[PDB]
Structures are given as structure tokens and as C-alpha cells.
């Protein structure tokens with residue numbers, strides 16, 4: 001126990017984070033359901049194209065999920081909670097469309113893939129700007145103090 | 150520096166996290182050892198079924214690891230540290246049995262897989278309840294104030 | 298809102314985290330570029346060895362990213378911010394060399410792979426020591442108080 005909590009500075013980030021977990025659960029579910037429909041038994045990860053695209057979509061979302069996370073949280077703490085959470089949401093909605101697109105074809109994944117990438121770059125930029133705002137003043141000051149002597 | 154630290158509210162979550170890291174290390178070690186026994190040289194990922202099942206078991210535990218993490222932390226902060234840590238432990242022990250099961254066969258993976266899924270779902274539910282507790286009162290209040 | 302922030306205790310961790318995200322971006326970019334040069338269209342993940350090595354290097358770095366993250370943060374918070382950040386940087390730089398090595402051959406990946414593993418074990422050790430320093434005193438004290446009664 002302390003007599004204050006910082007929950008209330010990260011609750012939006014936490015909500016978006018959870019939403020991302022749930023979205024991954026939906027993607028796994030679709031993979032399970034593709035495994036049944038095209039009869040691809042674990043441990044195999046190859047099969048008909050229609051299976052491979054679903055499986056790949058899920059794998060690519062899972063692999064980007066930690067990156068999404070890390071940049072969400074850095075942006076949301078160093079830049080602005082609300083703005084990070086919102087880019088997060090745009091990221092997740094884009095990945096849902098990416099997943100749906102890819103299921104249909106390689107080509108129909110592209111537009112939402114690009115939109116996923118833009119939303120993730122926005123998170124990167126907000127995180128970077130936030131970190132710059134945190135470190136740049138002291139560093140400029142130290143450099144000016146050095147030249148002043 | 151501040152004159153207080155919040156470490157002590159997250160130390161169980163941190164211990165469980167690290168335990169999870171160590172478990173992944175054990176899984177990688179088994180994969181390395183299966184690569185030697187069945188002579189599957191990187192960058193190959195395919196080979197005899199006994200190699201593929203170990204390899205897949207590891208890749209599936211790696212891929213769910215961040216999900217475990219995220220929910221572990223959200224649940225532990227917004228619901229209850231101890232309860233989240235404990236579900237976490239149950240998740241990790243279930244994955245260790247899943248890994249061992251899968252090595253032996255596709256079929257023996259299933260019971261511990263299901264247990265691992267139940268444990269993760271519990272973490273999800275805790276995280277969701279914790280977030281509901283945080284947001285719901287102010288939202289109901291704002292709505293009541295609007296109607297007044 | 299609050300009248301203190303803990304940003305300034307984790308800014309180095311956050312910066313190393315973001316550097317890690319950027320490095321994964323660089324790795325993906327090399328994968329895209331290898332897909333074009335060797336004509337391997339998603340959803341395929343197999344192709345000429347030169348493509349497979351790049352692709353594997355990227356996958357292995359993505360899969361260890363969250364482990365790196367988790368241990369970076371636990372070490373940075375329970376042991377020492379600066380020392381964790383520094384081992385983080387050595388981890389990332391080694392993975393860059395691992396990636397470049399692996400692109401050229403299976404064999405050239407090994408030295409920087411071993412350096413990546415050492416740097417991650419150091420983070421694991423710093424995390425474990427920090428957790429020990431947090432829990433061990435109260436536990437020893439409780440055990441002694443029990444025997445004293």
C-alpha cells in the first residue's frame with residue numbers, strides 16, 4: 001500500500017491492450033476453424049492456400065502484437081494517453097480488416113496492411129516525440145552550459 | 150528519484166513474468182536438443198514428426214507469451230496482484246505440461262492446452278472486471294447527472 | 298492527474314524499448330526487400346536459402362523481442378535502470394550483428410547469436426537479483442521471527 005495509485009493514468013492503454021488480446025483470440029478461433037474446414041492437423045502449418053493465408057494473417061498479427069504494445073505504452077505515457085489509445089484502436093481495427101482481407105486473398109490484405117503500418121508508425125512517432133520532450137531539454141542545457149564555460 | 154516506489158505493488162507480477170522467461174529458456178533448450186538429436190540445421194523448421202511437435206510447442210508458447218504478459222499485468226494492477234499472479238502460475242505450469250504432452254504426441258497436448266486456455270481466460274476476465282470497476286462508476290455517475 | 302510522475306525512472310527503459318521496435322522495423326524492411334529480390338510472395342515462407350536465412354533471422358528476433366522486453370523492464374525497475382538499459386543496448390546491437398551475420402550465412406550468425414544470449418542472460422540475472430533483494434529480507438526475517446518464538 002501507498003496512498004495514491006497511477007492506474008488512472010493508464011486505464012485507456014490497459015483497455016486497448018485488452019482489446020488487442022481479445023482480437024488475437026478471435027484470430028486464433030478463425031485459425032482453428034480453418035484447420036477443421038481444410039483438415040490441417042497440428043503440427044502442420046502448410047496446406048491449401050485458403051488455410052495458409054488465414055494462418056499467416058494470425059501469425060503476422062501475433063508477431064506485431066508486442067510491438068504494438070510496447071509503442072502504445074511508451075506513447076501513452078510520454079506523449080498523451082488519449083491520443084495513444086486512439087492510434088491503438090485505429091491499429092487494431094486495421095488489423096481486423098487486414099485479417100479479413102488476407103483470408104480472401106493476398107492482394108486484398110494490402111490496403112488494410114498499409115493502414116496497419118501507418119497507425120503503427122504514428123505510435124512510433126508519438127513515442128519518439130515524447131521521449132525527445134523528456135530528454136532534449138536537459139541535453140541542450142548541458143551542451144550550452146559546456147560552451148558557456 | 151522520488152521518495153516512494155511502486156515496486157512493491159508489482160513484485161509478484163514481476164516474479165511470475167521472469168518465471169515465464171525462464172520457462173521459455175527451458176523450451177528453447179529442448180528445441181536445440183531436438184535439433185541435434187534429429188539433425189535439423191537452421192534455417193530449416195521441418196523434419197521428423199518428433200522434431201516438429203517440440204518445435205511447434207515452443208513456437209506456440211512464444212507466441213502466447215506476450216498475451217499472457219499483457220493480461221497478467223492488467224489483471225494484476227486493476228483487479229488484484231495476488232490473484233493475477235496465481236492464475237499466471239497456473240498458466241505457466243499448464244504450458245510446461247502442454248509442452249511435454251506435445252513432445253510425446255499431438256493428442257497428449259490437448260488436456261494441458263485446454264487448461265492453459267482456461268487459465269488465460271481467467272486472466273482475461275479479471276482484467277476485464279478490474280477495468281469495469283475502474284470505468285463504470287464515473288460513467289454511471291455522468292449519465293445520472295445528465296438525466297437530472 | 299497527480300503532482301508527481303514516474304516517467305523519469307523509466308525513460309531509459311522506454312528509449313531502449315523504442316530502439317528495439319525500430320530495429321524490428323529495419324528487420325522487416327530487409328525481409329520485404331528479400332521477398333522482392335528472390336520473388337517469394339506471401340503467404341510462402343520457404344524459398345532460396347538467402348531468403349530463408351533473412352526471414353528466419355527476423356522471426357527469431359521477433360520471438361525473443363517480448364523476452365527482451367520483459368526482462369529489460371524487470372531488471373530496470375528492481376535492479377538499476379541504467380545498467381538494465383545498457384545490457385539492453387548490448388542485446389540489440391548483438392541482434393543487429395546476428396541478423397547481418399545470418400543473412401550472409403548460417404555459420405556467421407553464431408558469434409553474435411552467442412553474444413545476444415549472454416546479454417539476455419545478464420538481464421535475466423539482474424532481474425533475478427533485484428527480485429531477490431526485494432523478497433529475501435522479509436522472508437528471512439519471518440523465518441527468524443518464527444524460530445525466535
Ligand SMILES: CCCCCCCCCCCCO[C@@H]1O[C@H](CO)[C@@H](O[C@H]2O[C@H](CO)[C@@H](O)[C@H](O)[C@H]2O)[C@H](O)[C@H]1O
Nearest residue numbers: 090114115116117118119121122124125126128129319
Ligand atoms: C526515430 C523516430 C522515427 C519516427 C518515424 C515516424 C514516421 C511517421 C509516419 C506517420 C504516417 C502517417 O500518415 C498518414 O496516416 C493516416 C492514417 O492512416 C492517413 O489517413 C488515411 O486514413 C484515414 C482512416 O483511418 C482516412 O482519413 C483516409 O483514408 C486517409 O486520410 C494519411 O493519409 C497518412 O498520410
Ligand SMILES: COc1nc(C(=O)[C@H]2C[C@@H]2C(=O)O)ncc1N(CC1CC1)c1cccc2ccccc12
Nearest residue numbers: 021024025028029042209213216262265266269270
Ligand atoms: C492459451 O490460449 C490458447 N492457446 C492456444 C494454443 O496455444 C494453440 C495453438 C496451439 C496448439 O494447437 O497446440 N489456442 C487457443 C487459446 N485460447 C483459445 C481461444 C481462441 C479461442 C485463448 C484463451 C484465452 C485468451 C486467448 C487470447 C488469445 C488467443 C487465444 C486465447
Ligand SMILES: COc1nc(C(=O)[C@H]2C[C@@H]2C(=O)O)ncc1N(CC1CC1)c1cccc2ccccc12
Nearest residue numbers: 170173174175177178191357361364413414417418
Ligand atoms: C537470445 O537468447 C537466445 N536466442 C536464441 C536464438 O535466437 C536462436 C534461434 C536462433 C538461431 O538459432 O539463429 N536461442 C537461444 C537463446 N538463449 C539460450 C538458450 C539456452 C536457453 C537464451 C539466453 C538467455 C535467456 C533466454 C531466455 C529465453 C529463451 C532463451 C534464452
Ligand SMILES: COc1nc(C(=O)[C@H]2C[C@@H]2C(=O)O)ncc1N(CC1CC1)c1cccc2ccccc12
Nearest residue numbers: 060064067116117120121124318321322325326339
Ligand atoms: C504493422 O507494420 C507492419 N506490418 C507488416 C506486416 O504485418 C506484414 C507481414 C505482413 C504481411 O505482409 O501480410 N509489415 C511491415 C510493417 N511496417 C512496415 C515498415 C517496416 C517497413 C511497420 C510500421 C511501423 C513500425 C514497424 C515496426 C516494426 C516492423 C514494422 C513496422
Ligand SMILES: CCCCCCCCCCCCCCCC(=O)O
Nearest residue numbers: 005006007155158159218219222226
Ligand atoms: C504490457 C502492460 C504493462 C503495464 C504496466 C503498468 C504499470 C503502471 C502502474 C504502476 C503500479 C502501481 C499502481 C497502483 C495500482 C495497484 O497496485 O493497486
Ligand SMILES: CCCCCCCCCCCCCCCC(=O)O
Nearest residue numbers: 022266267268270271273274275277
Ligand atoms: C470480454 C471479456 C470477458 C471474457 C470472459 C472469459 C470467461 C472466463 C472463462 C473461465 C472458465 C474456466 C473454468 C474453471 C477452470 C476449472 O474448471 O478448473
Ligand SMILES: CCCCCCCCCCCCCCCC(=O)O
Nearest residue numbers: 154155156303306366367370373374
Ligand atoms: C511488460 C513487462 C512489465 C512492464 C512493467 C512496468 C511496471 C512499472 C512500475 C512503476 C515504475 C516506477 C517505480 C520505479 C522504481 C525504481 O526505478 O527504483
Ligand SMILES: CCCCCCCCCCCCCCCC(=O)O
Nearest residue numbers: 171412415416418419421422423425
Ligand atoms: C535463475 C537466474 C539465472 C541467472 C543465470 C545468469 C547467467 C549469466 C551469464 C553471463 C555470462 C557473461 C560472460 C560475458 C563475456 C563477454 O561478454 O565478454
Ligand code: NI
Nearest residue numbers: 001002003004
Ligand atoms: Ni499507510
Ligand code: NI
Nearest residue numbers: 150151152153
Ligand atoms: Ni529528494
Ligand code: NI
Nearest residue numbers: 004153301303
Ligand atoms: Ni507514485
